[PDB]
Amino acid sequence: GSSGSSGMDMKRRIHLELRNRTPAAVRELVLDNCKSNDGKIEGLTAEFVNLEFLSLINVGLISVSNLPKLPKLKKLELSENRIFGGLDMLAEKLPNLTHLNLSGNKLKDISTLEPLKKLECLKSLDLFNCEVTNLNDYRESVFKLLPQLTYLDGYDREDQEAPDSDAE
């Protein structure tokens, strides 16, 4: 509720929130400081279809198959996760995924963004705290693979940091 409490299964928490109103009537819901089941979302329900803002950090997740079909959700905050690879389910699940943070994940290669080529909407992305960031010309090793990408690590092609307001 008011005082952030840790050590609570996803579903268990999500419930405390729904108490306000249907899970399909919500728009912004931060599911941070929660406990997932062996890295398997056992709460998030497709009902969130409406939801647009989804914050997932320090949740200790490894799988991204459970993720419900969210054709609306455009922003997906993901950090401090154990996502090594297999970012394909996101291409189909979130076909309109524009905002996606991949800083901190267990991505130590470029192939981890192979299935990301399908998504021609990804405007902004972050891959900080990753071995891939070290790879030779990593900045280019990502652009060449993902042409649709406009922003990389905050900065854009012109090497100009992203905006603050009125940002789609």
UniProtKB/Swiss-Prot annotation:
The modification Phosphoserine is found at S165. Residues 130-168 form the LRRCT domain. The modification N6-acetyllysine is found at K93. Disulfide bonds: none annotated. The keyword Cytoplasm applies. Interacts with histones H3 and H4. Interacts with KLF5; this interaction induces promoter region-specific histone incorporation and inhibition of histone acetylation by ANP32B. Belongs to the ANP32 family. This is Acidic leucine-rich nuclear phosphoprotein 32 family member B. It comes from Homo sapiens (Human). The chain holds residues 1 to 161 of 251 of the full protein.
